[PDB]
Design a protein around this ligand. Sequence first.
Ligand code: C5P
Ligand code: C5P
Ligand code: C5P
Ligand code: C5P
Ligand code: C5P
Ligand code: C5P
Ligand code: ZN
Ligand code: ZN
Ligand code: ZN
Lengths: 161, 161, 161
Amino acid sequence: MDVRIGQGYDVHQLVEGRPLIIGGVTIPYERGLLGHSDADVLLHAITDALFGAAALGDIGRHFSDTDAAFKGADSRVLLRACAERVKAAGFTIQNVDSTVIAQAPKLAPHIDGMRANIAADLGLPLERVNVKAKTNEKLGYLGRGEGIEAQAAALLVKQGG
Amino acid sequence: MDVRIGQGYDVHQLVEGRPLIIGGVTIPYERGLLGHSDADVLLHAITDALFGAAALGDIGRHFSDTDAAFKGADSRVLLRACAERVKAAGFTIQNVDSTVIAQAPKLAPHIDGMRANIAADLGLPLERVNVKAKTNEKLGYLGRGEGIEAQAAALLVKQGG
Amino acid sequence: MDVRIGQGYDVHQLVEGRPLIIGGVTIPYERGLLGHSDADVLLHAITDALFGAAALGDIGRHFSDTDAAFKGADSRVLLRACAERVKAAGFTIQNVDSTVIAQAPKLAPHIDGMRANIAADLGLPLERVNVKAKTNEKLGYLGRGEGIEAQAAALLVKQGG
Ligand SMILES: Nc1ccn([C@@H]2O[C@H](COP(=O)(O)O)[C@@H](O)[C@H]2O)c(=O)n1
Ligand SMILES: Nc1ccn([C@@H]2O[C@H](COP(=O)(O)O)[C@@H](O)[C@H]2O)c(=O)n1
Ligand SMILES: Nc1ccn([C@@H]2O[C@H](COP(=O)(O)O)[C@@H](O)[C@H]2O)c(=O)n1
Ligand SMILES: Nc1ccn([C@@H]2O[C@H](COP(=O)(O)O)[C@@H](O)[C@H]2O)c(=O)n1
Ligand SMILES: Nc1ccn([C@@H]2O[C@H](COP(=O)(O)O)[C@@H](O)[C@H]2O)c(=O)n1
Ligand SMILES: Nc1ccn([C@@H]2O[C@H](COP(=O)(O)O)[C@@H](O)[C@H]2O)c(=O)n1
Ligand SMILES: [Zn+2]
Ligand SMILES: [Zn+2]
Ligand SMILES: [Zn+2]
């Protein structure tokens, strides 16, 4: 088994006037993430971990502002597209694990929805997808609720068939 | 062989009047970590990584306030119970690696004691457990000594036989 | 296959009067990283991830500023020495992935040069080395351009022959 590791990072500012969408789940909340389209910090981090494991670069290098195929793409579309490219490069996905750091709101009741979304987008059963939530103990911009961070890890095997 | 990756994160505030306990090792110091029980930032991060690798959620999901069987539990008990559940889920542990970010004090003389505690609670030989230490170059709440961070990574195998 | 995971972290201050050297690549910029020698945040993070995976401790414990054999060693010499120690411990490197978090300058056109330096230094083909770049969305010291962080992950196999 030619096994490979990938890691990903993302962060977005939390601001008034926007919906909170994490792992494709809309979480009712006074504020939301700032960025293009749905600003899905968790989906972006996983997308980068998968591209990383496959030595395919990063989410920026694959998905430009001018790319014709992804005009009006949101984060789930990019995640499905990433999955396709990783497959096409000759890899299979062992599993994904992740952590979202948000001081608030509480994410635990929404985690299973995030798992179902990610598993579908990756062609994985639920048992190979995991998402964990953590506060930042009121430390830093994350602790102050100025932002939300996601960390991801992915393991692939290059077939190798 | 069905290999799986997990990653974990923890952080605690560093305050007056608490002992500093990291990797189960009490380290002489004028401040210590805040949180329930012993606030062992490093064991918590390793625990989350193991649960993540097993797709079992996170520490918070497993170890609540109201569980009869774990009041009185400190971080080593939780790490041992985590190991038991990972084994009960059908997995074996390949190894763990980690980093503790603290501007001070020096952790290097205490690292081997941390490794031995962790290997014992996970039933691993020392040679499969690693702990590393970093400062934060005087940047951020970590660099100012307002908290301590731990990062961890675990690799399991779903047996598989 | 006796597979093992490693993870690494580094951060350095960004200051006037220093070159910006990341992954062995000099990137013209008004500011550069503070630290001994070249202060190569990326190469240090990768070095730690590899020592971690082999359970050989960390970069600081291996490379003393007192060691005769490495005074005047820059970060590429350290990464090469690291690779050599990991080999003698009986390990082979599957792959390395990483992220550099810098608000600026743009790193994308320099990434392939970094990958080439890393692949050379580790004895790997380019296909097993990845480097990704992220801003910090103007958050925190990273966001304000006061430093640069690197994250790494490495996968080893203990021979196992
Ligand atoms: N310093 C930086 C930061 C980001 N980038 C590129 O910009 C893309 C978008 O990054 P952000 O999401 O941080 O805005 C990244 O995925 C990477 O391709 C870069 O090339 N240099
Ligand atoms: N809907 C989206 C979301 C993100 N992206 C690209 O994904 C990369 C990372 O996303 P963020 O900068 O929003 O974290 C960016 O380069 C952005 O251009 C995109 O092209 N379309
Ligand atoms: N935003 C957050 C942060 C934490 N949590 C849950 O709270 C539990 C403990 O979080 P902390 O260690 O950050 O206090 C986490 O393990 C997670 O289960 C959550 O559901 N939503
Ligand atoms: N002694 C302890 C320490 C932690 N825990 C659980 O571990 C979770 C994560 O730990 P921290 O919040 O202290 O990082 C907490 O939400 C708490 O429920 C516990 O139940 N008993
Ligand atoms: N709190 C700390 C921070 C660093 N260290 C040691 O110092 C060495 C260099 O650390 P820095 O690069 O963060 O300065 C580390 O690799 C580790 O060996 C330590 O033992 N305790
Ligand atoms: N040129 C260099 C760069 C780093 N090092 C060692 O590498 C470790 C990590 O480097 P930094 O503290 O500069 O991130 C330190 O212990 C430093 O002593 C070295 O000995 N020679
Ligand atoms: Zn994003
Ligand atoms: Zn904790
Ligand atoms: Zn460094």
